[PDB]
Amino acid sequence: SFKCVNSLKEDHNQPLFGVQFNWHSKEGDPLVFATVGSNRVTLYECHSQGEIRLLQSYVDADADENFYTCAWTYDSNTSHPLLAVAGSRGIIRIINPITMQCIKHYVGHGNAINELKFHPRDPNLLLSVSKDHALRLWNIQTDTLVAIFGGVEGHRDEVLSADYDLLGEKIMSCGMDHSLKLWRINSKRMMNAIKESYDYNPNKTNRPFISQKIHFPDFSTRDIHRNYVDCVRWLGDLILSKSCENAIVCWKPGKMEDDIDKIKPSESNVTILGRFDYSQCDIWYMRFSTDFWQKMLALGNQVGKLYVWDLEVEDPHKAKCTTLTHHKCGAAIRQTSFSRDSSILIAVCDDASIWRWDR
Amino acid sequence: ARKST
Numbered sequence: 001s002f003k004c005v006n007s008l009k010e011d012h013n014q015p016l017f018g019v020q021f022n023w024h025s026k027e028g029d030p031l032v033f034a035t036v037g038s039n040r041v042t043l044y045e046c047h048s049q050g051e052i053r054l055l056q057s058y059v060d061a062d063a064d065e066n067f068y069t070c071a072w073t074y075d076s077n078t079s080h081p082l083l084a085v086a087g088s089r090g091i092i093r094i095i096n097p098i099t100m101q102c103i104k105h106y107v108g109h110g111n112a113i114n115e116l117k118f119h120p121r122d123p124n125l126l127l128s129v130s131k132d133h134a135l136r137l138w139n140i141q142t143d144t145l146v147a148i149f150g151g152v153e154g155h156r157d158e159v160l161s162a163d164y165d166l167l168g169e170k171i172m173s174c175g176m177d178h179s180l181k182l183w184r185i186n187s188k189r190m191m192n193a194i195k196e197s198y199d200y201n202p203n204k205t206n207r208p209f210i211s212q213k214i215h216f217p218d219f220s221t222r223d224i225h226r227n228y229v230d231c232v233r234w235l236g237d238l239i240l241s242k243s244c245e246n247a248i249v250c251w252k253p254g255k256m257e258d259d260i261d262k263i264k265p266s267e268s269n270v271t272i273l274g275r276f277d278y279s280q281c282d283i284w285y286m287r288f289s290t291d292f293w294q295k296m297l298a299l300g301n302q303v304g305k306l307y308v309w310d311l312e313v314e315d316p317h318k319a320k321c322t323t324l325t326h327h328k329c330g331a332a333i334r335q336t337s338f339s340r341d342s343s344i345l346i347a348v349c350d351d352a353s354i355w356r357w358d359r
Numbered sequence: 360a361r362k363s364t
Binding site for chain 1: 360361362363364
């Protein structure tokens, strides 16, 4: 049971394109989420009786910046959390969430960054996906660009989403060219590059750091969706992905029995294991999310309805759907986020509203 | 495909 306990509206009236709970917060500290929209990022604290305590924002000096996405990590030496933000200017900002100071930034991308993700096992490895058709992997410890995943066989239009698998050995990306593409980062070459990125200190050498140019995916398919693929997530070795066709497909590369690590780039088949249908979500840039454990799946649609899927069933097609509505919630939900313990679900909207659902 | 309605 989720019940709606509170809502609010940010003062800029622009779309909130993203929301992330900090899953690296300390034991005993209150639960905290960031929202991104307009040219800002804002942090809030969850307290009892549905209260959403407004903390502090970071506002970009450029009036024309528009933040699209954010991701949490932490400093690897001090335990302290960090929040990365990015959007239309194609600039990644690493923000100290306590003071909201911009610690540092990365340029390179030829255009808008549509999503950011951190590696599940290495808090320094930041993946950005761009409107310039490419993904980039950054080491935010040594401030190095580890690799660009692109080229003619990479995406031929905007990359909209990507996700590391559980161990962070491979990436799956999706975008406007209707395709989902796989990029392994556990090859000798990539493990070497990450290692070399850690040994790099510009003060102690003469060389620039050389990026990898990865121009070939380890698998590709245009067979799942017939429009823009705007969100992707690993579910073990299986994939969850959506287009703007009111469906989330659960699928895998190759045939039913094929091992994901034995899939070759020539692979021609995919296997569909289920599809979760819903209504009125035919605009693009609409992201579902999952809880920490991947027991559930949340997606908002374009008229303010929420869909939650219970994934704690023995095959993906057996997922149990439930819905959450509120008569005052009628604007489009761009993204959802669960607290780490899944007691709270947050939805953020095109009219700048923030909706809080408690279990 | 539109980004918004």
